[PDB]
């Protein structure tokens, strides 16, 4: 239906806001390419101007992983998205979609609707494009700081220094501009995205390189939510209370404002995949 149909854009949603780092964030990148802008030692995926932009690709991966965790918690058949597809190649009905690509476009639409997971429709799996699009994050008040974990400690033995290592992170208090856009997103999908964002905000999900050591923890202080288009997309959508179009404010009150969306998403009987 309209969720998978990209020919007509009936709803546009834009979640734009600033992200503050309450932890020494380090996204890494370029570990095998030590050709920086002559700043510290370890590349952290920064532009040529010296600004450590947070990659959109990382944002997506984080969102897809968190959504997979949430859906598997809610007993939803969701696979991985790396070397396989949601059903499709995983399913028996793989070449059927390819055959229906040529003719009977409605048949192909149906195959996708009944033989895919939610993350398939929201992020795209193969020969398809997800209903959402992330963007890079531009640091505003960024500050760089190094740290060395050269310490090998007692090593449960006699040696107290064998190896050496140091890292370069982004110091806390940095601000990044976060923007993401979605096309023909139903109410339940938007609520699920808001749930993912809230899980990230609370700290249950972390983004960075040294997550086990508590390096990636970010929070939102000011995020705008602009909705343009229709209010419901599919017949499976839950008629949410009209919150308007411009939703913004501090992070806590922002997530308190999106309560109808998350509540609708939780109270939504998800049809697909039929299996």
């Amino acid at each position: 239906y309209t969720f998978i149909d990209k020919r007509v854009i009936k709803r546009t949603t834009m979640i734009e806001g600033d992200v503050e780092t309450v932890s020494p964030l380090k996204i890494g990148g370029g570990k095998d390419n030590f050709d920086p802008s002559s700043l510290a030692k370890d590349s952290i995926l920064k532009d040529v101007e010296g600004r450590p932009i947070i990659p959109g690709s990382s944002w997506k991966g984080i969102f897809r992983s968190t959504g997979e965790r949430i859906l598997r918690l809610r007993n939803i058949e969701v696979c991985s998205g790396i070397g396989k597809d949601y059903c499709l190649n995983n399913n028996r009905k793989e070449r059927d979609f390819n055959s229906a690509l040529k003719e009977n476009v409605d048949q192909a639409l149906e195959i996708f609707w009944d033989y895919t997971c939610l993350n398939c429709k929201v992020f795209g799996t193969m020969s398809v494009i997800g209903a959402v699009r992330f963007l890079d994050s531009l640091p505003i008040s960024y500050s760089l700081n190094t740290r060395s974990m050269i310490a090998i400690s007692r090593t449960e033995g006699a040696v107290a220094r064998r190896a050496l290592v140091t890292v370069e992170y982004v110091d806390v208090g940095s601000k990044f501009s976060f923007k993401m856009m979605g096309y023909n997103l139903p109410n339940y999908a938007i609520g699920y995205l808001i749930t993912i964002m809230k899980n990230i905000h609370d700290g249950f999900t972390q983004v960075g390189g040294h997550k086990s050591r508590g390096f990636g923890f970010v929070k939102f202080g000011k995020v705008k939510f602009t909705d343009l288009g229709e209010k419901r997309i599919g017949d499976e959508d839950i008629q949410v209370k009209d919150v308007g179009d411009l939703v913004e404010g501090n992070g806590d009150e922002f997530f308190g404002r999106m309560k109808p969306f998350m509540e609708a998403f939780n109270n939504a009987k998800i049809p697909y995949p039929k299996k």
């Binding site: 449960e156 040696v159 107290a160």
Partner: protein, 270 residues
């Protein structure tokens, strides 16, 4: 000579526990400095609200102010934590290591350096041994070390042992005007307590620690030990004795085993 015995890994499980000592000064005159030579402002009078610095000290500079506000004259401050006089753990560890090195026969001196000052009292009370060298390292090259180095620590080899500081539970702080200048000392009955803990130790090591902490033979009483600023050029300064406050572990058998295995050279303190 030096007994170059192989070191014991710290991960190996021996005996782990915490023993609580009780440090008492017998000569009512003990000073361990901290390099400070200023006041300590004990009373900490906060009566600057009505007059803040005497209107920026507007051409008066004639009130005793700091002199009478607190009760700490200019003297050598003893190290203390939150107005609690404390004996540094490093000082206790150094004293214990010196005692062990001078007592254990097959020991190795840790630090020698060059001779810049002479204290004939120290050279006579404790037998000097300039011939003895030092432990080298704990790397695969020369991993075997002296027993004292293995027990306490060495460069790159950690300590199966850790000596905490010593806070005081009861005592009086006094100032003494000696050598012209003024100092800060403790009095009689100034009693100190601390918790030294042992991790992964053989029982013989426990006996060695007990012997080092004054308890040459008797578990229920130690000898007198030199410690503090002045302990050689003075008779009434630097005389302390150790005591066990929780003798919950068998100790006399351990001391007997240590003295029957190593035969440490008993010494007397002037």
């Amino acid at each position: 000579p030096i007994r170059r015995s192989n070191y014991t890994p710290r991960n190996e499980k021996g005996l782990e526990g915490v023993i609580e000592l009780q440090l008492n000064v017998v000569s009512d005159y003990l000073h361990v400095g901290s390099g400070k030579y200023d006041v300590e402002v004990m009373r900490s009078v906060s009566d600057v609200k009505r007059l803040v610095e005497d209107y920026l000290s507007g051409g008066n500079k004639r009130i005793p102010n700091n002199v009478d506000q607190y009760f700490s004259m200019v003297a050598f401050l003893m190290v203390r934590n939150k107005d609690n006089v404390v004996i540094p753990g490093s000082t206790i560890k150094g004293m214990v290591r010196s005692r062990l090195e001078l007592s254990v026969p097959g020991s190795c001196y840790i630090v020698t350096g060059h001779s810049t000052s002479s204290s004939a009292v120290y050279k006579r009370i404790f037998n000097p041994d300039p011939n003895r060298g030092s432990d080298r390292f704990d790397v695969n090259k020369f991993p075997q070390v002296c027993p004292v180095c293995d027990l306490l620590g060495n460069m790159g080899l950690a300590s199966r042992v850790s000596l905490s500081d010593f806070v005081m539970t009861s005592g009086k702080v006094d100032y003494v005007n000696v050598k012209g200048r003024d100092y800060e000392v403790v009095t009689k009955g100034s009693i100190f307590a601390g918790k030294v803990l042992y991790k992964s130790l053989k029982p013989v090591e426990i006996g060695m620690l007990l012997y080092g902490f004054g308890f040459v033979k008797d578990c229920n009483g130690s000898k007198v030990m030199l410690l503090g600023r002045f302990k050689f050029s003075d008779k009434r300064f630097g005389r302390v004795k150790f005591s066990l406050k929780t003798p919950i572990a068998d100790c006399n058998k351990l001391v007997s085993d240590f003295v029957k295995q190593f035969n440490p050279r008993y010494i007397n303190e002037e």
